[PDB]
């Protein structure tokens, strides 16, 4: 019997108390660090995938192949951490949304989210978004739900709406209701603009687990994880938890290297140290375990 | 016709006053950030490829597919900037050394490096490394040379040897010699153990450009670029330039997130901020030029 | 001094007397076979690709990754042989049409066609098609011409319209001329319905090279290369010239393997014969010239 | 729960009565065709993958990435039909054999085979084969077996040796044995020189279910389905069963296209027909059921 984190994430979002905290990772390393810090959930950012795999802004540039491989490898770094993964708008219509679902399920991906934008989608905290009508939107969600059923996957279907910005509060809620009716599992109102409004969605969709996108310095005012739990939310996501820090530091680092002529990393950061963050030691156990002798001796010095 | 940065680097390699300084990057973000900071050349670390793409240590886990893809994107962020891309051992015998060359060429890679380890390779600063003999190795260096000139490519072939730690300085120099005769453009003594030895290679192989691999806190004492230039090297790489610092900053930041429950990114790090680092302005022009409406009134909130 | 069939074909189309016959190929095998036949050009069918890569119909399930990979590899079987690569609707808006143009050009592709359906397009001989408005289409062509030009590519842009069935003859022509004005290299009126439309269109955009798509037993009367040349076409393609016969042959061989329980391939299908169809001899030479003893001996017996 | 055709097959293999007939497919077309002919199992040929995905010979060109992708798409067309996928040598040492085992399980691959060649392998019917040593090889086998249990897959680890051409019959059987020992489920003596040795090897490795690779016009004399069943094989594969014919038919099609200046395909082959061979109807039902109307009025021309 093979296992997926969809299952125990699914049980937790059925327990009305357990609260899910998920930092936003974008590649192998951010995922290894966020694990070491002791988080019990990860979020694979679409934006961060764009950044790292393409060097590109969050503009629909990422392909299903792109997202799925990244989502996959992030999922099996630790197969019991549920991974919540971006899936943008489904990489097409029903035919495509199902492949994405099927794919993300086989991959061990614990949840994903489908938004209501046109396929050449935009970061949610960006102006001038373009949406698809409610009918097409429900059709994506209904495909993802029917797709998981057919293969018996527990993968958690998260319905994002980007419509607040363009269409007003009332309409985004009509969309979330309509996604709840097609069988979605969690509701995702993107870019909540106020505490009044976080409070107001939660009651308007009372008893449906909702998710908060705590992207900072965008449309959404700062809510700590505790306050969100307390407000009623069931999941909070921090898409730039890794990406932000990593940018500031590399920048300073490259400017330092520029004036200086050598990086000057702390003497702690040895290649073995750096490798250990990426599972060196577990990787050599695997070799010694199967009769191999390549890491005979260790690996220092 | 189409241009590649092979020809600049190969040209610059001929003027013996030009000295190529290339920091390590390992994904799009590090790349854009290295570029933003004014570097004239980039080095894509294999180790860093393994870590960001796979979350794995540097042990030959990366496939040609992984490597090339990552090489092409990094190379095309800024087409006029030369990129020296790790090619491990050529991912096979000659047949593969050859596809490796052609594909890196087509990708717009400016230079690459092939070493004398078994395919199932390992970072050069760990104990244990297992090598192939001199003939096989030369076969690889010859395969790259032949495949480049067969397609009319100016990509720069860097001959590396990982054989100092087990076979001794003398052998290491003998393999560089063979390689030089086989037509490599640049010598790569991995894991130079002293300044004595740095000055010494340069002399024993005088006339022939050499790379210094400036990985700190490993086998090589800390030599700055200015100093390497003065010794007589032609290229200096720093594989962990972005990676060390990103690992530190993210570890920090994830620890903060865990205690704090909100990441607290500096206010300067809006979503737009971060996309703008990843070419958002330019992506927005392509559209407008083409001329699209998507982006109309930009994206600011 | 890297080179590309794109430029060879650019030139062909500059002289109106040149006539181009390009059979459909969909994978490495079809490609080798068609090359062995002596054909001077290839057409990588999108439909085709979907069937081999995915085991799926032509419904817009291939992503850019799929199509670029296939196109590149086909293109580099015989680098001197121009390959006309299907490129669907460009895999998104302008941003993606450039990435498509850039990648295809780096891959050695000679030409590609962009059409005017929605991104979840279907084969042009199915009913139903859904189209985007003319402006949105022109925006695509325009991005490919621009993208071409920013990078100095000679790649041929082929403007397709699927508008005949839904909008009729004259809207079709209107769209085509609109694309010509945007810098497109070749017109492509999908599923022309009569031999006199054939001739009407050729004088309707006279001076401008036109492609005939000779897919049989859908929408288009059966017209030959001789006949097409005479009519005044510049390029004739046959998406299923390899595909169909392969299907039918495999169908019959699977029944016969069904009943008889041993395939009974002809005495000449040895493994080695099959391999020589795919460059065994040439890639054994690659090795030797390097050279290892890998195939030292030969491979036979 | 998601269900793997690897279980249905593990269990089929405990039945001493179940004989598995598996034709070699290599792309989606050749999968879809094999299925409709009614086969209950498919074989992904390593060789055929090289040819179709790369245009290249069977020489170690394919990377794990390559092979997994084909193996995955091929398993999931009919997800209840077991797919036995080539795995070459496992693309490196344990670490890599582990990843291969893992990815092939997630993909739905029913079985995969691992050989004792150098990682730059060649078709086991070419000369020149250069092997690795027994220890090294058991390390590979033991790793796919440990990887498999670490994650709880039913995936069937087939053990293959190429050592017959190079090191003789008795060494060939020593290797195959060392490997039953490290936990492999199915044995694969590749390139059987004669029919009395096909009879012999079953005897020598009684207890353990074996696979015949029936590649025609190489080293192995031609032995049929019922005939290998009788002798006592559990699995027979025909790696070129899709690819031989396709080559012959395409060569002819090209000659005809020069002769006639048009393929002259049969009235039967409408685009629709070929598409339906590729599951177009299934595809269109997925859209309708999800509420999409993209295929309203259907898709046959009017
Ligand atoms: O992380 C993401 O990709 C995202 O979709 O959640 C987002 F943050 F960019 C967003 O659009 O909000
Ligand atoms: O960065 C690399 O991949 C490298 O090869 O330069 C190295 F640093 F890992 C090394 O092997 O020294
Ligand atoms: O081969 C193709 O992909 C094609 O676009 O030309 C076609 F045949 F499918 C078609 O749409 O005519
Ligand atoms: O199909 C294959 O790749 C194969 O391994 O079975 C073979 F036929 F090439 C072989 O090695 O015999
Ligand atoms: Mn996103
Ligand atoms: Mn390296
Ligand atoms: Mn097409
Ligand atoms: Mn094989």
XYZ file of N, CA, C and O in Angstrom, chain C residues 76-174:
396
model
N 17.070 18.233 -35.079
C 18.482 17.929 -35.008
C 18.852 16.522 -35.389
O 20.017 16.131 -35.282
N 17.884 15.780 -35.892
C 18.256 14.589 -36.577
C 19.045 14.948 -37.801
O 20.176 14.542 -37.887
N 18.482 15.685 -38.744
C 19.334 16.215 -39.827
C 19.339 17.713 -39.736
O 18.389 18.355 -40.189
N 20.380 18.286 -39.066
C 20.358 19.733 -38.813
C 20.203 20.502 -40.086
O 19.561 21.526 -40.042
N 20.739 20.031 -41.222
C 20.604 20.804 -42.490
C 19.207 20.796 -43.118
O 18.969 21.547 -44.032
N 18.309 19.943 -42.620
C 16.934 19.721 -43.130
C 15.904 20.585 -42.426
O 15.633 20.421 -41.230
N 15.322 21.525 -43.151
C 14.333 22.391 -42.478
C 13.143 21.662 -41.855
O 12.560 20.779 -42.466
N 12.774 22.058 -40.647
C 11.617 21.460 -39.983
C 10.540 22.499 -39.687
O 10.782 23.537 -38.983
N 9.357 22.208 -40.233
C 8.220 23.075 -40.060
C 7.463 22.549 -38.906
O 6.834 21.516 -39.039
N 7.549 23.253 -37.781
C 7.054 22.803 -36.505
C 5.678 23.410 -36.182
O 5.517 24.636 -36.238
N 4.683 22.574 -35.874
C 3.416 23.107 -35.460
C 3.654 23.842 -34.157
O 4.408 23.352 -33.293
N 3.068 25.028 -33.997
C 3.185 25.658 -32.696
C 1.869 26.078 -32.066
O 1.882 26.938 -31.180
N 0.767 25.410 -32.472
C -0.628 25.636 -31.974
C -1.018 27.182 -31.990
O -0.947 27.816 -33.082
N -1.359 27.767 -30.818
C -1.799 29.155 -30.686
C -0.740 29.957 -29.953
O -0.965 31.135 -29.559
N 0.407 29.340 -29.742
C 1.525 30.024 -29.075
C 1.680 29.813 -27.567
O 2.525 30.418 -26.922
N 0.872 28.933 -27.009
C 0.974 28.573 -25.635
C 0.709 29.695 -24.697
O 1.142 29.614 -23.577
N -0.043 30.717 -25.125
C -0.504 31.820 -24.243
C -0.665 33.142 -24.981
O -0.797 33.161 -26.169
N -0.604 34.274 -24.300
C -0.484 35.585 -25.008
C 0.941 35.899 -25.424
O 1.805 35.042 -25.341
N 1.190 37.141 -25.881
C 2.501 37.646 -26.356
C 3.752 37.144 -25.604
O 4.730 36.751 -26.232
N 3.712 37.146 -24.266
C 4.845 36.734 -23.475
C 5.192 35.345 -23.956
O 6.298 35.137 -24.386
N 4.225 34.419 -23.954
C 4.433 32.999 -24.339
C 4.721 32.813 -25.832
O 5.389 31.861 -26.254
N 4.239 33.720 -26.669
C 4.517 33.580 -28.116
C 5.995 33.935 -28.362
O 6.635 33.396 -29.254
N 6.537 34.835 -27.553
C 7.934 35.124 -27.690
C 8.749 33.921 -27.208
O 9.612 33.421 -27.973
N 8.454 33.428 -25.995
C 9.149 32.268 -25.472
C 9.124 31.088 -26.410
O 10.134 30.355 -26.550
N 7.984 30.934 -27.094
C 7.826 29.913 -28.128
C 8.773 30.158 -29.303
O 9.549 29.293 -29.681
N 8.741 31.366 -29.815
C 9.650 31.821 -30.891
C 11.112 31.714 -30.437
O 11.948 31.259 -31.172
N 11.418 32.102 -29.210
C 12.826 32.025 -28.762
C 13.280 30.596 -28.668
O 14.318 30.239 -29.220
N 12.460 29.764 -28.044
C 12.867 28.398 -27.845
C 12.963 27.632 -29.114
O 13.953 26.964 -29.375
N 11.957 27.768 -29.933
C 11.991 27.111 -31.173
C 13.215 27.528 -31.978
O 13.820 26.688 -32.655
N 13.555 28.816 -31.954
C 14.683 29.279 -32.750
C 15.952 28.721 -32.218
O 16.744 28.268 -32.987
N 16.154 28.766 -30.892
C 17.374 28.150 -30.283
C 17.468 26.654 -30.607
O 18.532 26.132 -30.775
N 16.311 25.999 -30.683
C 16.238 24.584 -31.035
C 16.610 24.251 -32.506
O 16.646 23.088 -32.847
N 16.875 25.218 -33.377
C 17.135 24.852 -34.761
C 15.878 24.725 -35.614
O 15.988 24.552 -36.810
N 14.670 24.832 -35.051
C 13.431 24.852 -35.892
C 13.415 25.850 -37.081
O 13.710 26.998 -36.920
N 13.016 25.447 -38.265
C 13.059 26.330 -39.433
C 11.891 27.320 -39.492
O 12.050 28.478 -39.815
N 10.724 26.825 -39.116
C 9.442 27.540 -39.162
C 8.414 26.906 -38.201
O 8.465 25.712 -37.865
N 7.453 27.725 -37.803
C 6.341 27.277 -37.007
C 5.076 27.979 -37.454
O 5.133 29.102 -37.968
N 3.924 27.328 -37.285
C 2.647 28.030 -37.485
C 1.812 28.387 -36.222
O 1.615 27.586 -35.338
N 1.304 29.606 -36.165
C 0.448 30.019 -35.072
C -0.952 30.188 -35.590
O -1.128 30.678 -36.682
N -1.949 29.733 -34.856
C -3.295 29.771 -35.400
C -4.191 30.739 -34.616
O -3.714 31.523 -33.806
N -5.487 30.703 -34.853
C -6.346 31.660 -34.184
C -7.451 31.077 -33.307
O -8.444 31.764 -33.030
N -7.296 29.830 -32.865
C -8.293 29.304 -31.954
C -7.953 29.759 -30.535
O -7.030 30.599 -30.308
N -8.707 29.210 -29.592
C -8.510 29.550 -28.198
C -7.346 28.636 -27.905
O -7.050 27.799 -28.749
N -6.688 28.795 -26.751
C -5.536 27.984 -26.418
C -5.822 26.447 -26.306
O -4.937 25.583 -26.550
N -7.041 26.119 -25.913
C -7.482 24.751 -25.853
C -8.050 24.437 -27.215
O -9.228 24.152 -27.390
N -7.179 24.490 -28.200
C -7.542 24.285 -29.584
C -7.782 22.807 -29.923
O -7.404 21.894 -29.157
N -8.393 22.553 -31.079
C -8.536 21.163 -31.516
C -8.005 21.136 -32.886
O -7.767 22.188 -33.479
N -7.798 19.925 -33.376
C -7.467 19.723 -34.771
C -8.398 20.497 -35.725
O -9.635 20.475 -35.563
N -7.816 21.164 -36.714
C -8.587 22.052 -37.599
C -9.660 21.366 -38.457
O -10.560 22.010 -38.976
N -9.607 20.051 -38.580
C -10.678 19.364 -39.270
C -11.789 18.783 -38.348
O -12.694 18.080 -38.817
N -11.759 19.051 -37.066
C -12.936 18.795 -36.280
C -13.881 19.950 -36.302
O -13.475 21.039 -36.538
N -15.152 19.661 -36.106
C -16.148 20.658 -35.878
C -15.982 21.252 -34.537
O -15.452 20.660 -33.661
N -16.446 22.464 -34.384
C -16.670 23.003 -33.079
C -15.803 24.196 -32.880
O -15.909 24.877 -31.936
N -14.875 24.422 -33.759
C -13.730 25.075 -33.269
C -14.226 26.307 -32.575
O -15.237 26.838 -32.930
N -13.508 26.752 -31.566
C -13.725 28.065 -31.017
C -12.601 29.038 -31.283
O -11.476 28.722 -31.066
N -12.924 30.236 -31.740
C -11.901 31.217 -32.133
C -11.777 32.467 -31.253
O -12.765 32.970 -30.746
N -10.573 33.031 -31.146
C -10.433 34.373 -30.592
C -10.586 35.445 -31.669
O -10.404 35.160 -32.876
N -10.945 36.664 -31.256
C -11.174 37.748 -32.210
C -9.909 38.038 -33.028
O -8.847 37.539 -32.702
N -10.025 38.809 -34.100
C -8.870 39.104 -34.948
C -7.728 39.870 -34.246
O -6.581 39.513 -34.375
N -8.030 40.938 -33.526
C -6.961 41.666 -32.794
C -6.078 40.779 -31.926
O -4.843 40.942 -31.984
N -6.696 39.840 -31.192
C -5.999 38.997 -30.254
C -5.091 38.071 -31.015
O -3.937 37.867 -30.634
N -5.592 37.537 -32.119
C -4.766 36.809 -33.071
C -3.571 37.598 -33.598
O -2.441 37.116 -33.578
N -3.816 38.803 -34.119
C -2.741 39.577 -34.759
C -1.668 39.823 -33.706
O -0.478 39.899 -33.992
N -2.110 39.889 -32.463
C -1.214 40.206 -31.404
C -0.219 39.070 -31.307
O 0.946 39.292 -30.957
N -0.673 37.858 -31.617
C 0.215 36.684 -31.570
C 1.329 36.729 -32.640
O 2.505 36.541 -32.356
N 0.921 36.976 -33.865
C 1.793 36.994 -35.010
C 2.823 38.040 -34.727
O 4.040 37.796 -34.842
N 2.330 39.197 -34.295
C 3.161 40.330 -33.987
C 4.192 39.972 -32.939
O 5.389 40.287 -33.113
N 3.794 39.260 -31.890
C 4.816 38.868 -30.923
C 5.857 37.958 -31.529
O 7.017 38.053 -31.138
N 5.493 37.099 -32.479
C 6.470 36.121 -32.984
C 7.488 36.852 -33.909
O 8.724 36.646 -33.800
N 6.964 37.747 -34.763
C 7.823 38.591 -35.581
C 8.771 39.429 -34.725
O 10.004 39.323 -34.823
N 8.220 40.235 -33.835
C 9.097 40.906 -32.870
C 10.135 39.998 -32.185
O 11.320 40.310 -32.143
N 9.677 38.867 -31.677
C 10.515 38.017 -30.843
C 11.638 37.505 -31.686
O 12.774 37.614 -31.345
N 11.288 36.990 -32.846
C 12.231 36.644 -33.918
C 13.332 37.688 -34.011
O 14.511 37.348 -34.100
N 12.922 38.963 -34.038
C 13.769 40.046 -34.519
C 14.705 40.537 -33.436
O 15.867 40.787 -33.705
N 14.186 40.641 -32.209
C 14.972 40.960 -31.003
C 16.152 40.034 -30.878
O 17.198 40.481 -30.480
N 15.978 38.750 -31.224
C 17.060 37.760 -31.119
C 17.850 37.454 -32.401
O 18.753 36.620 -32.364
N 17.504 38.110 -33.512
C 18.158 37.912 -34.790
C 17.866 36.572 -35.441
O 18.708 36.031 -36.162
N 16.679 36.030 -35.217
C 16.366 34.721 -35.766
C 15.849 34.848 -37.170
O 15.121 35.785 -37.482
N 16.172 33.867 -37.998
C 15.587 33.786 -39.333
C 14.372 32.931 -39.489
O 13.927 32.747 -40.612
N 13.861 32.412 -38.375
C 12.796 31.417 -38.343
C 11.579 31.944 -39.109
O 11.270 33.141 -39.034
N 10.923 31.071 -39.866
C 9.784 31.462 -40.669
C 8.502 31.430 -39.804
O 8.185 30.401 -39.177
N 7.777 32.550 -39.780
C 6.477 32.615 -39.124
C 5.325 32.312 -40.101
O 5.132 32.995 -41.134
N 4.564 31.280 -39.777
C 3.439 30.870 -40.618
C 2.116 31.125 -39.920
O 1.771 30.482 -38.946
N 1.395 32.081 -40.453
C 0.124 32.497 -39.947
C -1.056 31.544 -40.348
O -1.363 31.356 -41.520
N -1.722 30.935 -39.380
C -2.813 30.013 -39.705
C -4.142 30.627 -39.301
O -4.209 31.383 -38.273
N -5.195 30.323 -40.080
C -6.547 30.602 -39.570
C -7.469 29.429 -39.677
O -7.443 28.684 -40.658
N -8.283 29.276 -38.647
C -9.180 28.167 -38.567
C -10.555 28.734 -38.726
O -11.572 28.015 -38.507
N -10.592 30.024 -39.085
C -11.858 30.768 -39.225
C -12.811 30.362 -40.360
O -13.959 30.856 -40.405
N -12.367 29.510 -41.284
C -13.165 29.245 -42.489
C -14.494 28.679 -42.104
O -15.524 29.164 -42.563
N -14.451 27.675 -41.213
C -15.634 26.883 -40.863
C -16.635 27.716 -40.108
O -17.820 27.619 -40.355
N -16.176 28.570 -39.216
C -17.103 29.305 -38.377
C -17.438 30.657 -39.005
O -18.606 31.040 -39.037
N -16.460 31.363 -39.554
C -16.742 32.721 -40.011
C -16.911 32.855 -41.540
O -17.457 33.840 -42.021
N -16.450 31.865 -42.301
C -16.467 31.918 -43.774
C -15.288 32.551 -44.534
O -14.541 33.400 -44.032
N -15.207 32.174 -45.810
C -14.109 32.527 -46.713
C -13.510 33.911 -46.494
O -12.308 34.032 -46.341
N -14.352 34.944 -46.452
C -13.887 36.328 -46.557
C -13.354 36.813 -45.238
O -12.308 37.447 -45.191
N -14.027 36.499 -44.140
C -13.382 36.773 -42.848
C -11.983 36.152 -42.801
O -11.060 36.764 -42.252
N -11.838 34.953 -43.381
C -10.596 34.180 -43.337
C -9.412 34.915 -43.920
O -8.407 35.122 -43.239
N -9.581 35.253 -45.202
C -8.740 36.110 -45.982
C -8.439 37.429 -45.204
O -7.249 37.799 -45.037
N -9.478 38.119 -44.700
C -9.267 39.319 -43.863
C -8.240 39.043 -42.731
O -7.322 39.851 -42.489
